[PDB]
Design an enzyme around this catalytic site. Structure first.
Site, mmCIF file in Angstrom:
data_model
loop_
_atom_site.group_PDB
_atom_site.id
_atom_site.type_symbol
_atom_site.label_atom_id
_atom_site.label_comp_id
_atom_site.label_asym_id
_atom_site.label_seq_id
_atom_site.Cartn_x
_atom_site.Cartn_y
_atom_site.Cartn_z
ATOM 1 N N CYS A 138 -18.141 -3.318 -86.897
ATOM 2 C CA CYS A 138 -18.208 -2.119 -86.074
ATOM 3 C C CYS A 138 -19.566 -1.439 -86.016
ATOM 4 N N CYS A 191 -20.384 -2.206 -81.890
ATOM 5 C CA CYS A 191 -20.278 -1.099 -80.947
ATOM 6 C C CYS A 191 -21.524 -0.302 -80.592
ATOM 7 N N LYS A 244 -24.788 -1.960 -79.901
ATOM 8 C CA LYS A 244 -24.589 -2.673 -78.643
ATOM 9 C C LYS A 244 -24.686 -1.708 -77.457
ATOM 10 N N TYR A 265 -16.683 -11.452 -73.562
ATOM 11 C CA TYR A 265 -17.445 -10.247 -73.282
ATOM 12 C C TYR A 265 -18.698 -10.132 -74.135
ATOM 13 N N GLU A 271 -21.951 -9.575 -72.306
ATOM 14 C CA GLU A 271 -22.725 -8.393 -72.644
ATOM 15 C C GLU A 271 -24.147 -8.754 -73.051
ATOM 16 N N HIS A 283 -14.083 14.132 -54.283
ATOM 17 C CA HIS A 283 -15.120 13.608 -53.426
ATOM 18 C C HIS A 283 -16.462 14.328 -53.596
ATOM 19 N N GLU A 295 -12.487 8.456 -56.951
ATOM 20 C CA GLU A 295 -11.558 8.836 -55.891
ATOM 21 C C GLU A 295 -10.954 7.644 -55.168
HETATM 22 C C1 LIG Z 1 -24.195 22.161 -49.670
HETATM 23 C C2 LIG Z 1 -22.683 21.850 -49.628
HETATM 24 C C3 LIG Z 1 -22.190 20.883 -50.509
HETATM 25 C C4 LIG Z 1 -20.807 20.525 -50.555
HETATM 26 N N1 LIG Z 1 -20.402 19.563 -51.467
HETATM 27 C C5 LIG Z 1 -19.029 19.228 -51.515
HETATM 28 C C6 LIG Z 1 -18.587 18.247 -52.472
HETATM 29 O O1 LIG Z 1 -19.330 17.648 -53.289
HETATM 30 N N2 LIG Z 1 -17.226 17.967 -52.468
HETATM 31 C C7 LIG Z 1 -16.319 18.574 -51.612
HETATM 32 O O2 LIG Z 1 -15.109 18.213 -51.731
HETATM 33 N N3 LIG Z 1 -16.723 19.521 -50.697
HETATM 34 C C8 LIG Z 1 -18.040 19.822 -50.667
HETATM 35 N N4 LIG Z 1 -18.491 20.822 -49.712
HETATM 36 C C9 LIG Z 1 -17.471 21.451 -48.832
HETATM 37 C C10 LIG Z 1 -16.881 20.577 -47.716
HETATM 38 O O3 LIG Z 1 -17.978 20.015 -46.970
HETATM 39 C C11 LIG Z 1 -15.973 21.457 -46.851
HETATM 40 O O4 LIG Z 1 -14.949 21.954 -47.713
HETATM 41 C C12 LIG Z 1 -15.260 20.738 -45.695
HETATM 42 O O5 LIG Z 1 -16.256 20.187 -44.798
HETATM 43 C C13 LIG Z 1 -14.427 21.754 -44.964
HETATM 44 O O6 LIG Z 1 -13.604 21.195 -43.924
HETATM 45 P P1 LIG Z 1 -13.448 21.812 -42.482
HETATM 46 O O7 LIG Z 1 -12.427 20.991 -41.824
HETATM 47 O O8 LIG Z 1 -13.221 23.283 -42.588
HETATM 48 O O9 LIG Z 1 -14.792 21.537 -41.654
HETATM 49 P P2 LIG Z 1 -16.259 22.065 -41.302
HETATM 50 O O10 LIG Z 1 -16.129 23.239 -42.183
HETATM 51 O O11 LIG Z 1 -16.460 20.620 -41.624
HETATM 52 O O12 LIG Z 1 -15.524 22.413 -39.900
HETATM 53 C C14 LIG Z 1 -15.360 21.508 -38.787
HETATM 54 C C15 LIG Z 1 -16.075 21.951 -37.478
HETATM 55 O O13 LIG Z 1 -15.565 23.189 -36.944
HETATM 56 C C16 LIG Z 1 -16.469 23.404 -35.864
HETATM 57 N N5 LIG Z 1 -16.182 24.687 -35.189
HETATM 58 C C17 LIG Z 1 -16.315 25.969 -35.689
HETATM 59 N N6 LIG Z 1 -15.971 26.906 -34.823
HETATM 60 C C18 LIG Z 1 -15.591 26.215 -33.687
HETATM 61 C C19 LIG Z 1 -15.113 26.630 -32.399
HETATM 62 N N7 LIG Z 1 -14.950 27.922 -32.088
HETATM 63 N N8 LIG Z 1 -14.821 25.688 -31.479
HETATM 64 C C20 LIG Z 1 -14.989 24.355 -31.801
HETATM 65 N N9 LIG Z 1 -15.427 23.858 -32.979
HETATM 66 C C21 LIG Z 1 -15.721 24.853 -33.909
HETATM 67 C C22 LIG Z 1 -17.814 23.302 -36.559
HETATM 68 O O14 LIG Z 1 -18.910 23.178 -35.658
HETATM 69 C C23 LIG Z 1 -17.603 22.153 -37.524
HETATM 70 O O15 LIG Z 1 -18.292 20.987 -37.169
HETATM 71 C C24 LIG Z 1 -19.879 21.185 -49.652
HETATM 72 C C25 LIG Z 1 -20.395 22.153 -48.773
HETATM 73 C C26 LIG Z 1 -21.793 22.514 -48.732
HETATM 74 C C27 LIG Z 1 -22.235 23.574 -47.749
HETATM 75 C C1 LIG Z 2 -21.623 -7.583 -80.723
HETATM 76 C C2 LIG Z 2 -20.255 -6.887 -80.896
HETATM 77 C C3 LIG Z 2 -19.958 -5.815 -80.050
HETATM 78 C C4 LIG Z 2 -18.719 -5.105 -80.123
HETATM 79 N N1 LIG Z 2 -18.500 -4.060 -79.239
HETATM 80 C C5 LIG Z 2 -17.265 -3.376 -79.310
HETATM 81 C C6 LIG Z 2 -17.012 -2.302 -78.385
HETATM 82 O O1 LIG Z 2 -17.811 -1.909 -77.497
HETATM 83 N N2 LIG Z 2 -15.778 -1.675 -78.506
HETATM 84 C C7 LIG Z 2 -14.824 -2.033 -79.446
HETATM 85 O O2 LIG Z 2 -13.745 -1.366 -79.431
HETATM 86 N N3 LIG Z 2 -15.044 -3.063 -80.333
HETATM 87 C C8 LIG Z 2 -16.234 -3.700 -80.249
HETATM 88 N N4 LIG Z 2 -16.490 -4.794 -81.172
HETATM 89 C C9 LIG Z 2 -15.423 -5.144 -82.146
HETATM 90 C C10 LIG Z 2 -15.185 -4.159 -83.300
HETATM 91 O O3 LIG Z 2 -16.452 -3.914 -83.939
HETATM 92 C C11 LIG Z 2 -14.158 -4.781 -84.253
HETATM 93 O O4 LIG Z 2 -12.967 -4.981 -83.491
HETATM 94 C C12 LIG Z 2 -13.764 -3.914 -85.459
HETATM 95 O O5 LIG Z 2 -14.946 -3.654 -86.257
HETATM 96 C C13 LIG Z 2 -12.762 -4.684 -86.274
HETATM 97 O O6 LIG Z 2 -12.210 -3.941 -87.376
HETATM 98 P P1 LIG Z 2 -12.027 -4.512 -88.833
HETATM 99 O O7 LIG Z 2 -11.320 -3.460 -89.570
HETATM 100 O O8 LIG Z 2 -11.413 -5.871 -88.765
HETATM 101 O O9 LIG Z 2 -13.464 -4.609 -89.535
HETATM 102 P P2 LIG Z 2 -14.767 -5.509 -89.761
HETATM 103 O O10 LIG Z 2 -14.256 -6.596 -88.909
HETATM 104 O O11 LIG Z 2 -15.311 -4.163 -89.406
HETATM 105 O O12 LIG Z 2 -14.094 -5.668 -91.227
HETATM 106 C C14 LIG Z 2 -14.272 -4.765 -92.339
HETATM 107 C C15 LIG Z 2 -14.959 -5.395 -93.585
HETATM 108 O O13 LIG Z 2 -14.192 -6.463 -94.177
HETATM 109 C C16 LIG Z 2 -15.100 -6.920 -95.174
HETATM 110 N N5 LIG Z 2 -14.548 -8.090 -95.888
HETATM 111 C C17 LIG Z 2 -14.295 -9.356 -95.393
HETATM 112 N N6 LIG Z 2 -13.796 -10.180 -96.297
HETATM 113 C C18 LIG Z 2 -13.713 -9.428 -97.454
HETATM 114 C C19 LIG Z 2 -13.259 -9.719 -98.785
HETATM 115 N N7 LIG Z 2 -12.791 -10.926 -99.124
HETATM 116 N N8 LIG Z 2 -13.308 -8.743 -99.716
HETATM 117 C C20 LIG Z 2 -13.790 -7.497 -99.364
HETATM 118 N N9 LIG Z 2 -14.237 -7.119 -98.146
HETATM 119 C C21 LIG Z 2 -14.175 -8.145 -97.206
HETATM 120 C C22 LIG Z 2 -16.358 -7.166 -94.361
HETATM 121 O O14 LIG Z 2 -17.523 -7.344 -95.160
HETATM 122 C C23 LIG Z 2 -16.370 -5.991 -93.406
HETATM 123 O O15 LIG Z 2 -17.370 -5.050 -93.684
HETATM 124 C C24 LIG Z 2 -17.734 -5.510 -81.113
HETATM 125 C C25 LIG Z 2 -18.054 -6.589 -81.954
HETATM 126 C C26 LIG Z 2 -19.306 -7.305 -81.875
HETATM 127 C C27 LIG Z 2 -19.540 -8.456 -82.828
HETATM 128 AU AU LIG Z 3 -17.892 16.339 -47.132
HETATM 129 AU AU LIG Z 4 -17.319 -0.342 -83.742
HETATM 130 K K LIG Z 5 -16.651 2.582 -86.430
#
Ligand SMILES: Cc1cc2nc3c(=O)[nH]c(=O)nc-3n(C[C@H](O)[C@H](O)[C@H](O)COP(=O)(O)OP(=O)(O)OC[C@H]3O[C@@H](n4cnc5c(N)ncnc54)[C@H](O)[C@@H]3O)c2cc1C
Ligand SMILES: Cc1cc2nc3c(=O)[nH]c(=O)nc-3n(C[C@H](O)[C@H](O)[C@H](O)COP(=O)(O)OP(=O)(O)OC[C@H]3O[C@@H](n4cnc5c(N)ncnc54)[C@H](O)[C@@H]3O)c2cc1C
Ligand SMILES: [Au+]
Ligand SMILES: [Au+]
Ligand SMILES: [K+]
Ligand SMILES: c1ccc(-p2c(-c3ccccn3)c3c(c2-c2ccccn2)CCCC3)cc1
Ligand SMILES: c1ccc(-p2c(-c3ccccn3)c3c(c2-c2ccccn2)CCCC3)cc1
Ligand SMILES: [Au+]
Ligand SMILES: [Au+]
Ligand SMILES: [Cl-]
Ligand SMILES: [Cl-]
Ligand SMILES: [K+]
Lengths: 461, 461
Positions: free
Chosen positions: A41, A46, A49, A180, A184, A450, A455
């Site tokens: 481990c 882990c 890695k 893996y 990896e 979004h 999503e």
């Molecule tokens: C900078 C910024 C970042 C944003 N980032 C996100 C985000 O990451 N995630 C997210 O979920 N939301 C985000 N939003 C919000 C999202 O864009 C709005 O919630 C969504 O567009 C609203 O839907 P609506 O249908 O009211 O349309 P608009 O508010 O899209 O309304 C539709 C249209 O109505 C028209 N309209 C208005 N009056 C009239 C009229 N009298 N006659 C005809 N047409 C008219 C307009 O011209 C417009 O084109 C963000 C907003 C801003 C300003």
């Molecule tokens: C390159 C690599 C990447 C990995 N990446 C991930 C990851 O991203 N996510 C994940 O969930 N797992 C990952 N693993 C696996 C994870 O590390 C193992 O599943 C976990 O450590 C196993 O648990 P264990 O208790 O068997 O211990 P080890 O396998 O940790 O066993 C415990 C100990 O037993 C001891 N032992 C052995 N024989 C004896 C004995 N006769 N007497 C006394 N002590 C003894 C050893 O010396 C050792 O220290 C990875 C493994 C490798 C090799």
């Molecule tokens: Au949008």
């Molecule tokens: Au681990």
């Molecule tokens: K650990």
């Protein structure tokens, strides 16, 4: 012959977790560790890695700097710099870790442990012996390397354990595997500059994952500049003047096999699977069951085939994720020490993220797994593919794929698989919903956030 | 005097959405637009804002390049470059948009629209009149600017509409407001280089959001280098030699008021709220109800105080998010044309993301909103604060806060609020769970996806 309420073998993710929860419950635990506390481990898993993954992501975004209105960014990149920090961060956490284990009054027995030839609950750690009505095996596993018998020169290549010991960026990298850990590593090395190749036994990676993921991931690896050597295996390896030469055989169905010499490889990494550490526990001496690969067999309660003996973690071979080990270890503590004859980990719907580029997220059954469990007729799937608007201004691109697996009339979400920007942090919430038994309707009744990628999951048509 | 089944006033997010769904249901709709189709949403909202947010995030991560083992990155940054692309992307989508509206056989009536002095369902668009048993008001709102009467020189400052018309990076920026549009703009400008100031009537921004968010967001704005001018209001504005001079009064409780002249402002942006476009609809001529701010009043079904007339979107003033307008517009179409006397939008648990730095995510009630609805005794909250491990190697930092609001014995998750890296893509999944009625247990029975930030949500103790 000291005696405790709970004796844990292996002081890593699962062992420590389970032991700590026990003492929290009163139990007087004693975990045995032969190496560094924290297992795979902490030290070579882990975090180190993820850090390396972050560094790679950074590197990618930097190929976008100019696209995003900024003057071009160099890109030399110094591995030794990040390595140093990574080591720092690790030990930094590792320190906190220790502090806790310490204040948990858990005795740490140092040394390798194995069950002796006695009938009463006992193991022998360097001479001395210890007993307990409840003994946990949490020895985890290890990276698998081929024998010189099978592939001569095999010892020339390293594993993920070596990856984290690297002090420099291999100029030419070759990674063998399709899992893996393999995907990896190829991702990071390639991102960070290495001329990377990924050798796979078939045509796509992550074949155990859903078909969409397997196909998409393989394509992304390629787009990112990772040479995916399909239907290829390492037949032999050896050190040359400029590094290493890798001989591989490519066997593409519909084509004749072919040998290829891959030269100037700065280092080969074997990522062909993990092996459980049980071969020196001398389990047999008590009849503790194991499969042919060596994993300790257990029931839904982490019980071994022998009373008073349990196992959780990688050693059991199912769901190799630190959180699964943690959860399983704790539930056990609750069962054995809080007396909850129901305390057990649900292995269904465990969410997983594969840190590729972009990351992969998954939970539930794969489409194919669904079809088998419910029947073709009772399974509909939704999916979409698109380019994150983050790439709307980038020459460089990566797509995003999402697949929702539904079952029955109610269209219960039994599976969610995706790859793309954000997916690593997008899954946890959906996994929660999925374990509650969410339906396509549950997703669709949720207002979209979004604009995001997330999503798209609640608007699949 | 043409007649249609559905007549929509305003061709933006809500209007178009609703109209399109209607024709999909058979209805012969005719939307009226006085300006560009797509309203605030497309042209000066969402996307152009996200693009600008991405550019800013990029800029931030680039202050990390060196930290991540790379040689330092310049940073000149050319606004005109991104602007150009942004405009491209917009029209690029805008083209697809149009294509669809076109194939939806919806007639687009050009020109300003208002209800005349007749009793039968009719409005007058440039002379000609149109009727329909069902008429929707989806005219959205607009950015609010102060009168010269109130604040002399006020017309010198722009709004978010101007923000997206800017061709250069204002050297010195001043933004007045405390909402998300204000917070978002200050975030981008500051990130992109402008010496930014955010003037707020009180001590924190986003005061309608949960206390934790309000407090944390304000602190982040500051850490990021955004001067938060607290308890300050613009008393007067005027053009100087080097741009603009802003006179503000600061009234901090426990302190005496003070006048301050803010010089060399390259541009002032008013972000003090949105105003609904209803003042020229001559609603009264039919008795269509409105509140004092001008919003059209409606019931749970988007029905106005007059039969055959409805309203959705910003014009109604509740939940100003493009998705809410979309959802409301569609549900209406289903009710009026599919005859679903239940088809209506649930305004509870609508998730929202505020693109600050790091982004803010939220859904459900705020702690204070919970206490009022359930009672202090019936409300427990969980929360954690930590630094994303992405910053483990960065000198630069940003924390992550999470708060879970639970109600009753079962600890039903009625609220989720957070700020931090990834949160913009982390919320959607949890919102889904929250609308299903998830409980603290539902979260806790879900295995963590380690290592991520998301996992902190299912491990709150
Ligand atoms: C900078 C910024 C970042 C944003 N980032 C996100 C985000 O990451 N995630 C997210 O979920 N939301 C985000 N939003 C919000 C999202 O864009 C709005 O919630 C969504 O567009 C609203 O839907 P609506 O249908 O009211 O349309 P608009 O508010 O899209 O309304 C539709 C249209 O109505 C028209 N309209 C208005 N009056 C009239 C009229 N009298 N006659 C005809 N047409 C008219 C307009 O011209 C417009 O084109 C963000 C907003 C801003 C300003
Ligand atoms: C390159 C690599 C990447 C990995 N990446 C991930 C990851 O991203 N996510 C994940 O969930 N797992 C990952 N693993 C696996 C994870 O590390 C193992 O599943 C976990 O450590 C196993 O648990 P264990 O208790 O068997 O211990 P080890 O396998 O940790 O066993 C415990 C100990 O037993 C001891 N032992 C052995 N024989 C004896 C004995 N006769 N007497 C006394 N002590 C003894 C050893 O010396 C050792 O220290 C990875 C493994 C490798 C090799
Ligand atoms: Au949008
Ligand atoms: Au681990
Ligand atoms: K650990
Ligand atoms: C500089 C760069 C890589 C090595 P890598 C390495 C290894 C990798 C990480 C940690 C420990 N050992 C190891 C080898 C390496 C290798 C690669 C090509 C040619 C020769 N050797 C070879 C034997 C097993 C350990 C040595 C020097
Ligand atoms: C270069 C940079 C900004 C302007 P900004 C701008 C405006 C911003 C965006 C779109 C249209 N108009 C506007 C003004 C601006 C302003 C700011 C400081 C001093 C004088 N003017 C003043 C009147 C309303 C429109 C003009 C030139
Ligand atoms: Au190597
Ligand atoms: Au301006
Ligand atoms: Cl140690
Ligand atoms: Cl237009
Ligand atoms: K839109």
């Amino acid at each position: 012959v000291a005696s405790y309420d709970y004796l844990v073998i292996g002081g890593g993710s699962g062992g420590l977790a389970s032991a700590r929860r026990a003492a929290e419950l009163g139990a007087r635990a004693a975990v045995v560790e032969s190496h560094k506390l924290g297992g795979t481990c902490v030290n070579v898993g882990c975090v180190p890695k993820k850090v390396m993954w972050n560094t790679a992501v950074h590197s990618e975004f930097m190929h976008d700097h100019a696209d995003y209105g900024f003057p071009s960014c160099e890109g030399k990149f110094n591995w030794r710099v990040i390595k140093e920090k990574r080591d720092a961060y690790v030990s930094r956490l590792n320190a906190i870790y220790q502090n806790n284990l310490t204040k948990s009054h858990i005795e740490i027995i140092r040394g390798h442990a194995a069950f002796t030839s006695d009938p009463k609950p006992t193991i022998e750690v360097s001479g001395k012996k210890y007993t307990a009505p409840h003994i946990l095996i949490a020895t985890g596993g290890m990276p698998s390397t081929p024998h010189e018998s099978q592939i001569p020169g095999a010892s020339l290549g390293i594993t993920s354990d070596g990856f984290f010991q690297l002090e420099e960026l291999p100029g030419r990298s070759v990674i063998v595997g399709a899992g893996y850990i393999a995907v990896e590593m190829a991702g990071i090395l390639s991102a960070l500059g290495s001329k990377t190749s990924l050798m796979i036994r078939h045509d796509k990676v992550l074949r155990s994952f859903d078909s969409m993921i397997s196909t998409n991931c393989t394509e992304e690896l390629e787009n990112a500049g990772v040479e995916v050597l399909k239907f290829s295996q390492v037949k032999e390896v050896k050190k040359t003047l400029s590094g290493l030469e890798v001989s591989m055989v490519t066997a593409v169905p519909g084509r004749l096999p072919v040998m290829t010499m891959i030269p100037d490889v700065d280092c080969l990494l074997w990522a062909i699977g993990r092996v459980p550490n049980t071969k020196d526990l001398s389990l047999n001496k008590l009849g503790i069951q194991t499969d042919d690969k060596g994993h300790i067999i257990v029931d839904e309660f982490q019980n071994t085939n022998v009373k008073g003996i349990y196992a959780v973690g990688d050693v059991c071979g199912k769901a190799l994720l630190t959180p699964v080990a943690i959860a399983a270890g704790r539930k056990l503590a609750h069962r054995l020490f809080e007396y909850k004859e129901d305390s057990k980990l649900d292995y269904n719907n465990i969410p997983t993220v594969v840190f590729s580029h972009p990351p992969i997220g998954t939970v539930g059954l794969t489409e194919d797994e669904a079809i088998h469990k419910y029947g073709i007729e009772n399974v509909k799937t939704y999916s979409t593919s698109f380019t994150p608007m983050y790439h709307a201004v980038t020459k460089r691109k990566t797509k995003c794929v999402m697949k929702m697996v539904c079952a029955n009339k109610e269209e219960k979400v039994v599976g969610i698989h995706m790859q793309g920007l954000g997916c690593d942090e997008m899954l946890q919430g959906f996994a929660v919903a999925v374990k509650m038994g969410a339906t396509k309707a549950d997703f669709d009744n949720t207002v979209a956030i979004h604009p995001t990628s997330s999503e798209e999951l609640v608007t699949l048509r």
